[PDB]
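trehalose-6-phosphate phosphatase: structure tokens wanted.
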Amino acid sequence: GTPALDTAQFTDAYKKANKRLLLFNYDGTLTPIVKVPSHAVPTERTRNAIAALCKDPKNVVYLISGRDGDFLEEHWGHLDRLGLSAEHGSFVKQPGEEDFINMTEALDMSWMSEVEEIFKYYTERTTGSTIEVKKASITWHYRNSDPDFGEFQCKQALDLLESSLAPRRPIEVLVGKKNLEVRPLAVNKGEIVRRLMYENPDVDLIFCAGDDKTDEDMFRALRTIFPPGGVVDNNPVVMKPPVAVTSALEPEEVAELPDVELTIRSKGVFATTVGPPAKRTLAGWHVTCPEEVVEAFESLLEEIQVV
Ligand SMILES: O=P(O)(O)OC[C@H]1O[C@H](O[C@H]2O[C@H](CO)[C@@H](O)[C@H](O)[C@H]2O)[C@H](O)[C@@H](O)[C@@H]1O
Ligand SMILES: [Mg+2]
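Answer:
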């Protein structure tokens, strides 16, 4: 379990920080889980909060989501300083650019047809189920199927994917909130976080929030930068160039990339899961609802206006 996010302690750290890495999951984190995937549109207050955070040059703000780049662009593309990571770190659109860096170019993607065929099979035989073919991942939804037959069908599809496909393909099979998803094995939200840390060695405050099991990759990455027993004394925390950085480059470029000394210390990392106190997680904190994640920064933002 975890203590509830100490917004007081976080507020003061936020004010003292020179460079802040702010990482937000989307679904279930910045916006509630709802019936229909395309209906998960950010509220006015939510859009305003993230905007203000991007307005600050001290902040480096990213969304890290399993969503497709199109959906993310549609609702967030209007914020010039907001970075976007789509489909579990298979794509990355920095605040500067306008196009997504394909993190999967060097990966074997021949598995997509096989997975699509399987999900089509179950979509046709599971009323209310839907399929979401994305650019580097595929999601099968059953949230609007019959409660019982949906889970049953889910277990059968899962068993088929795990028994006959996973063991021979570079994929990971994700059990999401009333969905199944298949992604490339070599990418995850954790690698994106590490890429971002490598890019910004001057970060002295990290916030990261997520509601799903896939977000635990982020929480783990935010821990394993430090030695298993915590940093000892005033030792330098050094970080090698991560896979999410090197795989995009050419071997000549990669050979030139140096190790970096990170400014961040564990006390500066606020890893927050969305869920109940009892939820077992690698995050250091929790908040019960996505709405409280937003309100935390709304209250914080208002306080910044004063002084
Ligand atoms: O990584 P995030 O930003 O959380 O999204 C990953 C996952 O999320 C979406 O599905 C979920 O949210 C919708 C909207 O509330 C629900 O209807 C689904 O039941 C949830 O599973 C995306 O649509 C998926 O493609 C993606 O895998
Ligand atoms: Mg989520």
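Residues 150 and 162 are 18 Å apart (CA to CA). The longest strand covers residues 59-64.

Cheers.
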